[PDB]
């Protein structure tokens, strides 16, 4: 009577670049009966609308399908000099002593590049600029990119909850050198880069 | 594995008797939301409802490790670390019927 419940992306991330005519996303059903999906773009604030359209919005897997979901730009006002965030999110909904049962949401990174902003962030990564003040660890980003830190280490100490840092945006989380990467357009990590203070 | 596996796995009444545990597993993910569907919810995150074949919820000791609240497409949610466990009690005093009681979780997770 445990109640087990998945569902499978093809990517943690999706990288839209300005020029193209859309991009795609696999979403596939790990369980032997089917489940009903719904897909929706959010803002970077996970809440407000973005110009961005799903299709299928809705639809169906059968047992064990693999389903592509195209993602296309619809209008909007989107910045041409920074990229600009927003969440492709998946809900998955499993048919109908305790009756368990479960619905999960499992949203991605749906980063906007404009055709202007040019290369990748790992290319610039090595430009953040690191400030410590006393317990206070600031990442300055001075760069068009979101920065989508991974494996973090102060003084060789890990660094969690940093969160991602925006274009030309700064990040302060409450000794030593830091050492960072960052994870790719492609998912991975990058090489380690390394800051001296 | 970076996608989200969710788990519920079943556990008069004791104060605070355990009824299900709930286990969300990612490779990738750092935190998750969860809250309780119901018809009659009776808070803002939705981590204490009431079941129709009584009240149930998540422990005081799963309420302490939240990270957070925060306010999502118009819900609040509380966050937790990932690979967590998390336990559903009977909340309140000793509750007292031989019935089957659904019980629902929502899970959200955003990857990094």
Same mark, same amino acid.
């Given at each position: 009577?445990?109640?087990?419940?998945?569902?499978?992306?093809?990517?943690?991330?999706?990288?839209?670049?300005?020029?193209?005519?859309?991009?795609?996303?696999?979403?596939?059903?790990?369980?032997?009966?089917?489940?009903?999906?719904?897909?929706?773009?959010?803002?970077?604030?996970?809440?407000?609308?973005?110009?961005?359209?799903?299709?299928?919005?809705?639809?169906?897997?059968?047992?064990?399908?693999?389903?592509? &979901?195209?993602? =296309?730009?619809? $209008? /909007?006002?989107?910045? *041409?000099?920074? %990229?600009?965030?927003?969440?492709?999110?998946? #809900?998955?909904?499993?048919?109908?002593?305790?009756?368990?049962?479960?619905?999960?949401?499992?949203?991605?990174?749906?980063?906007?590049?404009?055709?202007?902003?040019?290369?990748?962030?790992?290319?610039?990564?090595?430009?953040?600029?690191?400030?410590?003040?006393?317990?206070?660890?600031?990442?300055?980003?001075?760069?068009?990119?979101?920065?989508? &830190?991974?494996? =973090?280490?102060? $003084? /060789?100490?890990?660094? *969690?909850?940093? %969160?991602?840092?925006?274009?030309?945006?700064? #990040?302060?989380?409450?000794?030593?050198?830091?050492?960072?990467?960052?994870?790719?357009?492609?998912?991975?990590?990058?090489?380690?880069?390394?800051?001296?203070? | 594995?970076?996608?989200?596996?969710?788990?519920?796995?079943?556990?008069?009444?004791?104060?605070?008797?355990?009824?299900?545990?709930?286990?969300?597993?990612?490779?990738?993910?750092?935190?998750?939301?969860?809250?309780?569907?119901?018809?009659?919810?009776?808070?803002?995150?939705?981590?204490?409802?009431?079941?129709?074949?009584?009240?149930?919820?998540?422990?005081?000791?799963?309420?302490?490790?939240?990270?957070?609240?925060?306010?999502?497409?118009?819900?609040?949610?509380?966050?937790?670390?990932?690979?967590?466990?998390?336990?559903?009690?009977?909340?309140?005093?000793?509750?007292?019927?031989?019935?089957?009681?659904?019980?629902?979780?929502?899970?959200?997770?955003?990857?990094?």
């Amino acid at each position: 009577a445990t109640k087990l419940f998945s569902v499978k992306l093809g990517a943690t991330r999706v990288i839209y670049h300005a020029g193209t005519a859309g991009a795609t996303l696999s979403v596939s059903n790990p369980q032997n009966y089917p489940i009903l999906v719904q897909s929706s773009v959010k803002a970077a604030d996970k809440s407000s609308p973005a110009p961005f359209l799903v299709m299928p919005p809705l639809f169906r897997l059968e047992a064990n399908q693999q389903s592509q &979901l195209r993602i =296309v730009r619809t $209008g /909007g006002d989107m910045p *041409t000099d920074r %990229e600009t965030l927003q969440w492709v999110c998946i #809900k998955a909904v499993p048919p109908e002593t305790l009756d368990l049962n479960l619905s999960i949401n499992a949203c991605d990174k749906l980063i906007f590049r404009p055709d202007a902003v040019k290369g990748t962030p790992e290319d610039v990564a090595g430009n953040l600029r690191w400030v410590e003040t006393g317990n206070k660890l600031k990442v300055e980003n001075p760069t068009p990119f979101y920065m989508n &830190l991974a494996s =973090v280490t102060v $003084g /060789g100490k890990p660094i *969690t909850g940093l %969160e991602y840092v925006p274009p030309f945006a700064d #990040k302060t989380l409450n000794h030593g050198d830091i050492e960072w990467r960052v994870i790719t357009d492609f998912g991975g990590e990058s090489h380690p880069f390394h800051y001296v203070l | 594995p970076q996608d989200l596996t969710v788990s519920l796995i079943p556990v008069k009444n004791a104060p605070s008797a355990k009824i299900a545990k709930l286990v969300v597993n990612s490779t990738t993910l750092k935190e998750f939301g969860v809250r309780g569907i119901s018809n009659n919810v009776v808070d803002s995150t939705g981590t204490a409802w009431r079941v129709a074949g009584i009240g149930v919820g998540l422990s005081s000791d799963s309420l302490r490790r939240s990270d957070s609240t925060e306010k999502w497409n118009g819900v609040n949610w509380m966050t937790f670390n990932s690979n967590d466990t998390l336990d559903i009690v009977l909340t309140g005093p000793a509750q007292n019927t031989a019935d089957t009681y659904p019980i629902t979780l929502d899970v959200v997770g955003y990857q990094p």
